[PDB]
Design a protein around this ligand. Structure first.
Ligand SMILES: Cc1cccc(Cn2c[n+]([C@@H]3O[C@H](COP(=O)(O)OP(=O)(O)OP(=O)(O)OC[C@H]4O[C@@H](n5cnc6c(=O)[nH]c(N)nc65)[C@H](O)[C@@H]4O)[C@@H](O)[C@H]3O)c3nc(N)[nH]c(=O)c32)c1
Length: 180
């Protein structure tokens, strides 16, 4: 079988694109690119789309589980939050692509052990004032789930102990609940 069957992923994922157009509302600028649920289809999609290094400022990439929209209003997002990573212009050249791909691999590979059910998706923001990468979780009050994801994430990215990342509730964003 392995010689001809695609390798299924634990979850089905949806990749979203966002471009900032002042003529439209924020929700109207969200566009769904494609959905995938196999290892082969992910790499086909990833190799066909632009790297975030080469996106114009004001655009976003979002990878979310099928059934969860890239909105904080979503049922699985309103009571949750995100682990935030801030990038300067030097990091856009050095780390932007590596961190986003590692983020994608942490989602589709289910790298967070039992707490991978609390992951909702990931977002990279390409802005002129600085780039951001976030992993969204479903419940901000689950200290065990949120902090374990933060520890696994920070080690996966290779961040040194001198750097600290913060987790912010989406309700507050519209302060850091935890830091790791
Ligand atoms: C809570 C949360 C947590 C994490 C992520 C999100 C994502 N999110 C973001 N928004 C809305 O989008 C506004 C600006 O977004 P941000 O405040 O995050 O600012 P950014 O850094 O993203 O962008 P920018 O600094 O380069 O801004 C540059 C200039 O463009 C204006 N602008 C930005 N976009 C649009 C747009 O789409 N059309 C128009 N005409 N102008 C826009 C900005 O105002 C500024 O004048 C924000 O207030 C909200 O209304 C959301 N809305 C709902 N309902 N749900 C969400 O989940 C959500 C939300």
């Amino acid at each position: 079988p392995e010689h001809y069957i695609k390798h299924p992923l634990q979850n089905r994922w949806a990749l979203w694109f966002f471009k900032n157009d002042k003529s439209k509302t924020w929700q109207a600028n969200l566009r769904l690119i494609s959905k995938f649920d196999t290892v082969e289809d992910f790499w086909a999609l990833y190799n066909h789309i632009q790297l975030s290094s080469n996106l114009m400022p004001g655009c976003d990439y979002s990878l979310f589980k099928d059934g969860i929209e890239p909105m904080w209003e979503d049922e699985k997002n309103k009571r949750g939050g995100r682990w935030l990573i801030t990038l300067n212009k030097q990091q856009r050249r050095s780390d932007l692509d590596r961190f986003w791909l590692e983020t994608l691999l942490c989602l589709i590979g289910e790298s967070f052990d039992d707490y991978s059910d609390d992951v909702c998706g990931a977002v990279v923001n390409v802005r002129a004032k600085g780039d951001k990468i976030a992993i969204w979780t479903t419940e901000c009050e689950n200290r065990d789930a949120v902090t374990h994801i933060g520890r696994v994430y920070k080690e996966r990215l290779g961040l040194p102990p001198k750097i600290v990342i913060g987790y912010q509730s989406h309700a507050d964003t519209a302060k850091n609940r935890f830091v790791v």
